[PDB]
């Protein structure tokens, strides 16, 4: 999959494409409709399936700091776009171009001149051009006889509108199950593992892995979650008895340190039945279900007791998750008990 | 109008004065009674009307950081004092003088030796001297046969005591209309315009002007207000179609950035029907009415829609404000519609 | 009293001891049972009474930053241990030793090899060894025929469990009276006096003393308390009419400054009927009773009036405290009135 | 004078223009040659004189955290352009447009489509387009018989190249005399006066005015300088015996205070005033001495009386030579 | 290769081992002699080759805020150990164990009880036990007929002592050639690429990749260097014309930005790419020039074209001599 | 000894006094001449000896962020005044009073109305009143037949002017020997001991005591010094083999750690102790060596054993000459 930053970077010799346009934050089940429709049509006519997306978030152009939290990083957006069969991602920066352009010149410049589009696919909520004047309707009118438009209704399922907004609200509430339901996969973050307390190994209280994330990263509410931890492919040695590319049952504590801001979130994972230290490795953490809210501990005894209940509850939740195997990892490690 | 910092700076040859004494923060309608009475009496006997005020705030001398927010800056206090006909402002710093003095020596030193007063005007809540021992009553007793005292009752109107305290509560609540009512004018801040997002001009989402204020500045609660933006007299060129000294209809967003403190407040003004960038200019922003609370936006479309409703509501509120012309600006710009 | 940091620092020639083991934070009335039982038994057999305690807090080993607030500093723990007749304190750092040891090797290494114990005294909630496996029960089993164990039930009195946890909750609530009740003494902090506002002396609004404490220090909720201020023995001159080693009646304001963190707490003491400045001195502040919540002041007059009510209420509370003379200071200064 | 942010803000009905192009930081004597040629030309052929300038600095596009110090603010650049009779300033942001463009397109789009220029004026060092391919030469042909180019050599005078760089060098070493000579005027900063050390009045040690400036602002080296302070036009009252729009003799101490951040403290000669809240312009005439620490009141006051005598002399000299002296000023011969 | 944190993590059933002991920071040519002797020995006598190393640095135990810069991360130390055929790394933390121990106990506990070693290999400068009483000598006797000691002298070559210290010295002065010669390989750092100045593509001035490093990381002096950049194995897509696992010629600018903090910005020769989000390895070949400030686009681009020509030459040279050159690389002869 | 903050705190019934006036920072040998003359005089004529001093420093009134470093704290200044037999200290804050006053009024108000002085003692460099008009001369007349003035010349000894300035110079360069000679005693700091590197005990590398000081506190240059450490009187238990009120030989490392901030770390010779929570006084005797970085445990311990031998010698020397040595001390001849 190609990745182009700005119209100027798109190959001039590009001859034909089917194009979809959106922020696509989270690439949720609604987003997958647009992508699927686009990949289908590109296949039919032997064109390339192109996603036009936006970075920075279009909102943050007008309101820096008051931008929506990113359900996925841009990099993960790319990987997800690829995994659903996008051939090329064009990334538009509204501080560079396509901001003040009229709806007409937008179609002319982006869809025709830049992309050589024969088909365009948008959601019914799509807008474009200066002061968001252009709508799904405009696009259909301007594109008459020039290229075909397919406008897809927003996805409603089980009484919930599936959008980036709702996914963010679910995550913020700590309801990763409903977020996963809307995403069509386990919500996850990826990142390098750093040093924490310990000495991950024999000690049940020291995390198997510690990660930190900037405050633009959407993460579930502080608390403990059941999930899966996967060491990403690597040749580097692994301290302990965990193997790369296997999803390991884990109780996950999401926290907020600050006093400082960057209001930095931590993610601390206690991997069930394994003694490992993951420092320096790149690790994926998938969230499956909420287990409990955060609480303060006043003795090691109380703390470890609670830690043990987390593990028990996690084992239960994950044993269930494996049965919903469209969500579950291909290769996993979960012991029936301790 | 003269401005003197400390008793020592007052001209020795000053021969006669009518004096009023208070913090005078906000110079509200109650404060105007004291000032009016003082200016009247000074006119009668051909004396000078003197305001004795305090900086730093007397409270902050005992409780730094826990001082009341300043309804106006000291500089604006001066301008307002002048506008009601004060001839001289004496500024007392309680960390330098007049702090430990007995009520008797206070009258002797300040009113007689320093100011050569023949008339003094205070509010019924006035205190003075070490540990606030002296009252309106004391002042009348000590001044017997030495200079006349006029004690003015605190202003009650429509069931509300008009004081700095109540004005601050109204502002804090976001109720600028009642604050204006108590002030006897539109509450306003003044300050240099800096760079924000954009590029103020054709784009409706980029503010016409961005200003920042330190956290000692009283400002209304975060939200959107209808108000008027006036470029203060200047020879410097103005980017766009706004002229100096004209009050322009504006929707005003008051915000709080931090994470850092100084808990710095922002003020972002969207000037109705104008395309201008005000960087480097000195700008007055008068608040007229609350429009809505702050909210997070998840798409440019949603944001601009809301921005448009702000403008509609602002136009309505301001069209009304012009009719209460004792509050309204002399020269203004308000279009009937877009 | 000896103080040893780590097992290695304990004299090899130590021949016999009676040992108690716990965090002992606050040395509350429950803690005093363990200490009393231990000192008694050590007296009987002519052994030394040894406290084994922990620093850092065992919780913070697993959860740094999320550690319980310290009811007393380590130094005060030592002084209190001494005052109840402990001969030696052994301080264990769980990041250095005794963390991963089995229950069996813990008894063998710590109680026998290191301490030459003939008697050990723990609370029924005691745990030890890797992953807190060992309990009061384990200890009794492992120690069979090797040294005697005495397990003391947790202290319940007036329907309240007396533990570090409950003391912390009382303090956090601002209920120092119940905290004192559980501690068996007035809760107190000690620290150097620094400069504040003023000029402690004739001015009633300037504190007699200002102290700051780091955010790991447990302190009552922000507000005003009645208490006693004692200048610790010193040869350094004292500005004003307070003498060293006398407990002086004081109204105490506990505050939180930040914006910055270290979320630093202040303690400002207004000593009744005295004019003194305590800069540079080391001062103990004992808390006796809650007087009022914190509030913002908008005039010096209002502030001083409230200050006067604080003093009146304090005089009342302290006059009562003197009658409960098991709590009260040996040598005190309290005037019947102003 | 109009100010346009980006090509899109330019009036579509712009008939005809004479254009000059550059960063124009400082608007020094070399810059003034370009503007003069442009203004003289435009007034002749009926047309508007346009300056195309850049913000942020083209260097800062590639080297954030490594951009040259602003000799003047962008606001002062506008004011200086207007004073030399420019009719419109077009401000180009290289992160938005005109950056990755070819030389060929840059000309047609900017000079032709946007500005409809008959005449362009650039300095011999002018570069443009993608990776700065376009040069003083590129320009003269690419504009064949459409618009009349005019290249002006960089200014040498007294063996010295006059450029933004040399001005920045002169300032950096505290040689304000040479900076001014290159600028064609007193170097100045403008800013709101805040509270600082004590209160301005009878005391010689408390500054008449205190100002702070961000670290993007070029200031002379830390030290004391002779200069003039002006209260900008205002109806706000002035505490003390100073009125607006008169340049008052002052000794000026420039200090650094990390964490930015530069300070400017003005001791106005023979005045008792406190200028808190006013906007104030401070012009630098000549360097007086380096910064130094003090450990007694006597010593500090002694040196400050020397600063004052030194300032009187240097400023009296500035009044003769006359060319850069203020129109209305206040300078006493004696204390 | 196994990694054990503390003596307690070592498999109790560890039959027999050949052990080497040291900080091993940088795993330089002197270090490689120790590992070689250890690995060759262990493969012979059926046994496992073990490295005992230290984290945190033994100096940092006594001098926090004053610890020497890490030539490599602990993670890279593991990777280097494994590449030279070490079977297990035992990481000792002196704040937890082995610190206040006598020389006598250190041997029995670590080499005997924990590691069950028949053979130990240390450098002639080896010290241990309480207050470093134990030395190269202490070791040879205390291990009498139990385990066969083997002391190796520090490496001198070309009149130069090869040690972590001299490597740190070479890096500090920007002499990467000498650092590499002492290391037996190109010095490198590895890190996630973040966003920085602009976007990597057609523009020569926007870096292909931007990385920041904490102040514990040894980096060469601020300046420009010739080097190779490798995208580490990945299935993530790559924006632009670069694939993973090929070393691409690059000019590398190393910068400092307080408050830590070092930056590494790579301008990959003859490529248009943006490597945001990828893990990237940057090897340093030779110093090109010191850091310098710029005040025009032309100037900055001019110097950067010089950096590129200079890099081509130096890297072509690195391809001959051959011994440290990358296996798979990309280097064009001409622009 | 009484302490009065401001003229208003002085007992109205103050009958008669001999007064000395100055900053008195450090209370050095020059200062001691003033106090001696004042104390000897007052004990004679039945009266109280008064010191008028200043806080904040008179320089800091005009130059905030530029005030000279305190040779001692204000608290230590009180303690030193008392030790030389001053009966009352009057602390004047120039932001509150006595600042913009004329010379004439300063005398009548301070010396006459407030202090009711018969005798004043100042140094030949004394200045006062508005803009320091009043001088050693001004004083002798303005006090005509009311109160007997007495001016004392600044102390020269061994070709050296003894002043707060020269003391600050001596400290700054790390020459504590000369500072002490000028002070008439060992320079010292006093402070609460906190936790730092490791735990104080058997290990030579972990300091017996760790202290930090704000940047207003004058400390010797970064380096190692020979000195004495005293635990101030206390009933709090002491971990280890040290008792209060005995000066123990120590090697003292002074460090800087931005962002203030100075550190003082004491390695007490031949003791195993940890002094956390105690108030501790540290006296500086002689400079031993400059600061230096370490990169091995052996090296660091080696140098520290040298520091110890060096300290023993220097401190044994301090015990002879005798004049500044502590009354009760602990210094072993050998390890």
UniProtKB/Swiss-Prot annotation, chains D, E, F:
One of its GO terms (biological process) is FAD biosynthetic process. Higher divalent cation concentrations lead to decrease in the turnover of riboflavin and the 5'-phosphotransferase activity, while the adenylyltransferase activity increases. Pfam families: FAD_syn (PF06574), Flavokinase (PF01687). Transmembrane segments: none annotated. Signal peptide: none annotated. With magnesium ions the highest turnover of riboflavin is observed between pH 6 and 7.5, while that of FAD is between 7.0 and 9.0. With zinc ions a steady increase in riboflavin turnover is observed between pH 4.5 and 10, while FAD is the major product at pH 7.0 and decreases rapidly above pH 8.0. Its EC number is 2.7.1.26, 2.7.7.2. It is an enzyme of class 2 (transferase). The keyword Ligase does not apply. Its cofactor is a divalent metal cation. GO terms for molecular function: ATP binding; FMN adenylyltransferase activity; riboflavin kinase activity. Keywords: ATP-binding, FAD, Flavoprotein, FMN, Kinase, Multifunctional enzyme, Nucleotide-binding, Nucleotidyltransferase, Transferase. Pathway: Cofactor biosynthesis; FAD biosynthesis; FAD from FMN: step 1/1; Cofactor biosynthesis; FMN biosynthesis; FMN from riboflavin (ATP route): step 1/1. It comes from the Bacteria. It catalyses: riboflavin + ATP = FMN + ADP + H(+); FMN + ATP + H(+) = FAD + diphosphate. Catalyzes the phosphorylation of riboflavin to FMN followed by the adenylation of FMN to FAD. Belongs to the RibF family. This is Bifunctional riboflavin kinase/FMN adenylyltransferase. It comes from Corynebacterium ammoniagenes (Brevibacterium ammoniagenes). The gene is ribF.
């Amino acid at each position: 999959m190609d990745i182009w930053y700005g119209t100027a970077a798109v190959p001039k010799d590009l001859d034909n494409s089917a194009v979809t346009i959106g922020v696509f934050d989270g690439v949720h089940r609604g987003h997958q409709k647009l992508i699927n429709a686009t990949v289908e049509k590109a296949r039919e006519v032997g064109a390339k399936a192109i996603m036009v997306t936006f970075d920075p978030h279009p909102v943050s152009v007008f309101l820096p700091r008051a931008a929506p939290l990113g359900i996925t990083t841009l990099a993960e957006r790319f990987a997800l776009a690829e995994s659903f069969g996008i051939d090329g991602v064009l990334v538009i920066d509204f501080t560079r171009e396509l901001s003040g352009t009229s709806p007409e010149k937008y179609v002319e410049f982006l869809l025709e001149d830049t992309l050589h589009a024969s088909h365009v696919v948008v959601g019914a909520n799509f807008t474009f051009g200066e002061n968001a004047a252009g709508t799904a309707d405009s696009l259909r009118q301007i594109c008459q006889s020039r290229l075909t438009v397919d406008v897809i209704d927003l996805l409603d399922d089980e009484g919930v509108r599936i959008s980036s907004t709702t996914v963010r609200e679910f995550l913020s509430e700590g309801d990763v199950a409903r977020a996963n339901w809307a995403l069509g996969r386990h919500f996850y973050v990826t990142g390098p593992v750093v040093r924490g307390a310990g000495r991950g190994g024999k000690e049940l209280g020291f995390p198997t892995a510690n990660q930190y994330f900037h405050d633009t990263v959407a993460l579930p509410a502080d608390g403990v979650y059941a999930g899966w931890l996967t060491i990403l492919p690597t040749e580097a040695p692994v301290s302990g008895n965990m193997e790369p590319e296997v999803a390991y049952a884990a109780a996950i504590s999401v926290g907020t340190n600050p006093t400082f801001g960057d209001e930095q979130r931590s993610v601390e994972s206690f991997v069930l039945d394994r003694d490992a230290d993951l420092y320096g490795h790149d690790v994926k953490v998938e969230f499956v279900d909420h287990v409990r809210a955060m609480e303060k501990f006043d003795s090691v005894e109380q703390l470890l007791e609670v830690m043990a209940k987390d593990v028990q509850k996690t084992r239960t939740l994950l044993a269930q998750d494996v049965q919903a195997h469209k969500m579950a990892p291909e290769t996993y490690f979960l012991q029936a008990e301790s």
